[PDB]
Design a protein that fits this description.
The complex is a heterodimer of chains A (490) and B (490). By secondary structure, chain A is α+β, with helices and mostly antiparallel strands. Chain A is built from 16 helices and 23 strands. Chain B has 16 helices and 23 strands. Classes of the chains: A alpha+beta (490), B alpha+beta (490). Chains A, B: Pfam families: FGGY_C, FGGY_N.
Chain lengths: 490, 490
């Protein structure tokens, strides 16, 4: 009878899903939109194609579900983070979106890093880098003819993609704590735009949205858009939303997203924890309570499997990796550190390059496939062990297409000595935004009810003894050391 | 009108070739024979199987050539070195041969080396090793029923495979200086059996062949064997024969044989030079003068291309390696140290294993092929640079199947900054034995005539400046560092 609609506005695709209270999908839609690459290292989206893709996703999902718009109890919104937009009082872009992947501001933030880096890290949980919204917003109103003067009294709204979508759906100009936290203009311990950061990036207050909790009615949709006046009541950044959708509701519950690269986040609850090797960020603001997180990422995980397929071409499909790797009882001394663009935490070596080591006459395709799957697990452990210094790790909940690889998921549990939990619902980003929106209109009673209803497809239990974990991991660290500094030699 | 028959009795096949004055081939025969491995690490040949293969090869070579037995002016003999045989007065073997590959005697050699290791190196030019004949002959004496007793009287003949063939051929019991020098019983500087070593290894003098020049009539075949009485008049170990067949008649001329592994020999003329990284051996003895050599080997050169083909299955044929590698202008930072069973000279690290390094998302089959061919050239340079510390290197003359690879041979020249000379005749081992035999019956007037007749198919000329050369080889050394010690980690 009644359902929650989730919008997951991802970086290459917009998705829409209709869920019931048992997290069954009744309809879904998904449309790709163009990735604009105007100069080298530059990444842009056209907000009108994001919008058209999203709105068609919605229509497909409603059609597939065979519901009327008035059966939609609420809408949650979740989104590619950091990506920075600007628009008219009428909701019309004053420029393309500058995507989180875009490096145009690399040197702008390089300069301020020596002077203001540690202050930026304390206020925000973030290491200054072009990734985040501040430099990008500044770039727009310093290079866009007219923008700064249009901003200088109040004709310009800034937003992250959530904020752009919410404005277009409801008329309101809002963001949630988790999206806000990724702007590098938001003070995370106070829960407010930081005035010093605004002055550093020459940002006029008038463009800023109002910052709200992640679960709350922000506004209602116009009838002429969706056919009903639906409350829009859920907002979080995508990775935070996936962490919610995984029901990672307690401190120490980790969620790892496996893709081209990886994004890993751990719930720290009310603790605001700081690491030299991790981002500190906001998970969500729920019923007056802010939950925090620690975040680590890896550029190359699944891409190492794409390299097996496209570079040396020893497989036709990523999935063949599993059959090859399970022909072996161990790695037989063969490791692969796929440091195609360096090493990140905890080694931080831009000059490291990929290495395969332990090759003998008997080394086969099997060894390379297994070394590649092991490497994804080892890199994951590298991040999780940094988190573990600050918060006890309970378990790993996982999403992304590579989580269908049973070998990788088992080895991941084994090497962490932690359970790995794979959800029945694969679209955890969407499901999280659905949970946040639904809680705000009592579609679910509270988070304990959500957690009681939540269903695992499969639980991978750790089966590897300490001696074995520590010998395998030791191999990994030794291989990593042999990858370091290679591009200085060459 | 007349020709020279050369027998090249190799490790896995016996070969026979009829040559003329111009080193043209007129007849060839070739027969594989069984490798016998009675235990792991143990390696034997049946002498009757060798003999039967060698005799059929001769008859095919003679048939092939359309000649009468008395058109054969002389026979030269060359052979797998070290391999140790024993037989009785009517040519009957009293056991299988123990092959140079056989490790059965490794234990026996290991305790001998602690005490006597250093006088063996000064007497012979050899580091004690199960490789050489001494220990294998001890083993026969101490394990074959009633052999020591028969050898206490003068009833038992020992020798290397040349000595065997020459005895069945002519009834004489002889070897030359080059083969004798590989027994580890023969004093290199004194040119006689060393009495200490015969006692160390408990050899009855009675068993020893007479040691001759490499070019002199030892005897004559039986009319009933080949159909005429033919002088047998040339003998040298296969690698020494190849050096001769490459016309490497002056100090500093190197022969690299490229196979699954490599043997590399430089002529050092009268000079007896000693290295911690190379064997000192005898090249040949000719017109009352003995020439010396330095020898290095590498376990894995061509086997790394076989690994591309049969381990990782990235090529179908060894030759595709040429075209892959010339797709690239450089290695682009990708190195492959194929240290499958460790590093030999000058690193001497049994725990090193294979490394591929410099991998990025754009690393392709082309990078792996090129890095493998570069490795074979870098490894060769590692050995040749050890030779340059004791003798000036003039040029490299090459043989073996991989010398057909123009990319490898050009790169080999470039990295050494030396000319690489590929001969017209590929059968350099047999050719050398043919030259030694023909010199004894004036088929050729002297080594100057052979030198003046000798023909290169291609001379590869260095085209790489010094700065490029040292940058590329620096890369190699850095990749080798990172290969080291790996089997102590896993």
């Amino acid at each position: 009878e009644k359902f929650v609609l989730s919008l997951d506005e991802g970086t290459t695709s917009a998705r829409a899903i209709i869920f019931d209270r048992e997290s069954n999908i009744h309809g879904i839609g998904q449309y790709e939109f163009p990735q604009h690459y105007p100069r080298p290292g530059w990444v842009e989206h056209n907000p009108e194609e994001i919008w058209d893709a999203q709105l068609r996703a919605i229509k497909d999902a409603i059609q597939s579900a065979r519901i009327e718009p008035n059966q939609i109890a609420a809408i949650g919104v979740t989104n590619q983070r950091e990506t920075t937009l600007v628009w008219d009082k009428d909701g019309k872009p004053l420029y393309n979106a500058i995507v989180w992947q875009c490096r145009r501001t690399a040197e702008m933030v390089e300069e301020i890093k020596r002077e203001y880096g540690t202050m930026i890290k304390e206020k925000t949980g973030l290491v200054p880098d072009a990734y985040f919204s501040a430099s990008k917003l500044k770039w727009l109103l310093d290079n866009l003819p007219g923008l700064r003067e249009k901003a200088e009294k109040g004709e310009v709204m800034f937003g992250t993609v959530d904020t752009f979508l919410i404005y277009r759906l409801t008329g309101e100009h809002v963001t949630d704590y988790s999206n806000a936290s990724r702007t590098m203009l938001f003070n995370i311990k106070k829960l407010d735009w930081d005035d010093e950061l605004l002055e550093l990036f020459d940002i006029p207050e008038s463009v800023l949205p109002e910052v709200r909790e992640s679960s709350e009615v922000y506004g209602y949709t116009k009838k002429e858009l969706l056919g009903a006046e639906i409350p829009v009541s859920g907002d979080a950044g995508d990775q935070q939303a996936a962490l919610f959708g995984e029901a990672a509701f307690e401190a120490g519950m980790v969620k790892a997203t496996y893709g081209t690269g990886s994004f890993i986040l751990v719930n720290t609850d009310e603790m605001v924890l700081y690491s030299d090797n991790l981002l500190t960020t906001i998970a969500w603001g729920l019923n007056g309570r802010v939950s925090y997180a620690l975040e680590g990422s890896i550029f190359v995980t699944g891409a190492a499997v794409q390299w097996l397929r496209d570079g040396i071409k020893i497989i036709k499909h990523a999935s063949e990796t599993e059959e090859l790797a399970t022909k072996l009882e161990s790695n037989e001394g063969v490791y692969f550190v796929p440091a195609f663009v360096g090493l990140g935490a905890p080694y931080w070596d831009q000059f490291a390059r990929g290495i395969i080591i332990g090759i003998t006459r008997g080394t086969g395709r099997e060894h390379l496939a297994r070394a590649t799957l092991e490497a994804i697990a080892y890199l994951t452990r590298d991040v999780v062990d940094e988190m573990e210094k600050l918060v006890q790790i309970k378990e790993l909940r996982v999403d992304g297409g590579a989580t269908a690889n049973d070998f990788l998921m088992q080895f991941q549990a084994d090497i962490l000595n932690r359970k790995v939990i794979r959800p029945v619902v694969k679209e955890t980003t969407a499901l999280g935004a659905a949970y946040l929106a639904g809680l705000a209109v009592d579609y679910w009673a509270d988070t304990r009810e959500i957690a009681e209803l939540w269903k695992a497809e499969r639980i991978f239990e750790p089966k590897m003894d300490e001696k074995t974990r520590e010998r395998l991991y030791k191999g990994w660290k030794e291989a990593v050391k042999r990858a370091m500094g290679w591009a200085k030699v060459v």
